[PDB]
Every structure is written in C-alpha cells, then in structure tokens.
Write a protein that binds this ligand. Structure first.
Ligand SMILES: C[S@@+](CC[C@H](N)C(=O)[O-])C[C@H]1O[C@@H](n2cnc3c(N)ncnc32)[C@H](O)[C@@H]1O
Length: 196
C-alpha cells in the first residue's frame, strides 16, 4: 500500500521506526539492502572521484546513501516524481548528521540544468521506457561524465513478456555511450558508462 508519510514520520520521531525499517519500505531500496556496501564500493571503485551526484528517480536511495556513507565529500542531488516521498525523505535526512550534502529537487526543469560528475538511473530505464520516453534523447539531457544505470534481475521462474534488459540496453546504446564495466550485484545488474 502507498505509505502514509505523516504517520511514518510520527512513528519515527517516537522511536517506533529505525532507518533500517525505513529502508524496507520502498522495494527498490529493500532489494539493495543486502548488497548495500558492495553496490557503493563497486560504483565509487569504478568512477574516480565523485564530487557531485544526481539521483534521478531516487526513491529511498537518499536514505541508503546516508546509511552507507562514512565521510565522503559529495553534493548529492535527489529527484523523484513522487513529491510527497521527497518531502518525507527531506524531513528525515534533515534530522541526521552526515558529510554528504543533500539537495532535494522538486522542479524537473531544474534537474537537467545542473552539472554532475555522475548520474544515477537505478532501476529506471524500464520505468521510463514504459512511459514512452525516448531513452537516448533523455540521456542526452544530462551534463554528466558518467552514468550508473541498473536493471532488476527478475526471478527465472510470464508469457509474451520478454524483458531482456541486458540485450536491449547493450544494443540501443551502441556507439552513443561507452560501457566501462558491468556487474551483477545481488538482484541488480549494474552498468557503469561514459556520457551522452
Ligand atoms: C523501480 S523504482 C527505482 C527507485 C530507486 N531508483 C532505486 O533503485 O532504489 C522507480 C522510481 O522512479 C520514480 N519515477 C517514476 N516515474 C518517474 C519520472 N517520470 N520521473 C522521475 N522519477 C520517476 C518512481 O517514483 C520510483 O521511485
């Protein structure tokens, strides 16, 4: 069920909910918890010095980054179409102490105007494709040097629904962006690419 943000915030403020509990709320972040350290170790290990990040369609990742981070110096810009979810996250993170500088964006038009060392599109391409977004044109909107593009790895166990994201992605990006590396991190296929 869609979360009751106001109620969740009250429970949290009362100590009835932990960050661990919160990370389980959004399935995309819940699925990443088991490999949280491996995910970020992989990303920052393959992308030399990130000072700025744009997390497009961020979900609860802002919270996951807080959980994983120790002392990174990064300006993290978070954007998601769900405004209420962003408001909730901003209220929680505003209560926390962290070296990462959070910037919650609410205007889509502002998103594409920034300059970011890297742009996160975690479990996003399928969603956008579904919304009939021209993915290539979309990717060209970002003034970034690298992308972190990931896809969920679904259970192998229906009819008429292909979804071979790996084949699709490595196929349509041919000659536009260069794939620097890719790896299966838990239930997620993560791609590290160049720009445009
Ligand atoms: C599969 S979830 C991925 C969440 C997060 N990126 C992660 O991997 O943990 C899809 C996310 O994209 C957001 N979203 C859907 N359509 C969007 C759009 N047109 N623009 C920005 N965000 C969108 C949803 O609210 C949701 O949080």
């Amino acid at each position: 069920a869609y979360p009751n943000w106001d109620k969740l915030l009250k429970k949290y403020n009362q100590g009835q909910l932990s960050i661990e509990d919160l990370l389980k709320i959004h399935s995309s972040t819940n699925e990443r918890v088991a490999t949280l350290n491996d995910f970020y170790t992989y990303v920052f290990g393959n992308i030399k010095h990130v000072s700025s990040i744009l997390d497009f369609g961020c979900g609860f990742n802002p919270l996951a980054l807080y959980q994983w981070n120790e002392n990174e110096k990064i300006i993290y810009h978070a954007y998601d179409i769900d405004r209420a979810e962003i408001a909730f996250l901003s209220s929680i993170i505003g209560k926390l102490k962290t070296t990462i500088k959070y910037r919650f964006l609410n205007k889509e038009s502002d998103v594409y105007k920034g300059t970011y060392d890297v742009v996160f599109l975690l479990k996003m391409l399928p969603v956008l494709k579904q919304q009939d977004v021209n993915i290539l044109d979309f990717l060209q909107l970002f003034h970034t040097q690298n992308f972190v593009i990931s896809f969920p790895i679904k259970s192998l166990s229906e009819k008429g629904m292909e979804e071979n994201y790996q084949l699709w992605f490595e196929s349509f990006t041919k000659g536009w962006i260069k794939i620097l590396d890719s790896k299966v991190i838990g239930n997620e296929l993560v791609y590290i690419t160049s720009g445009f």
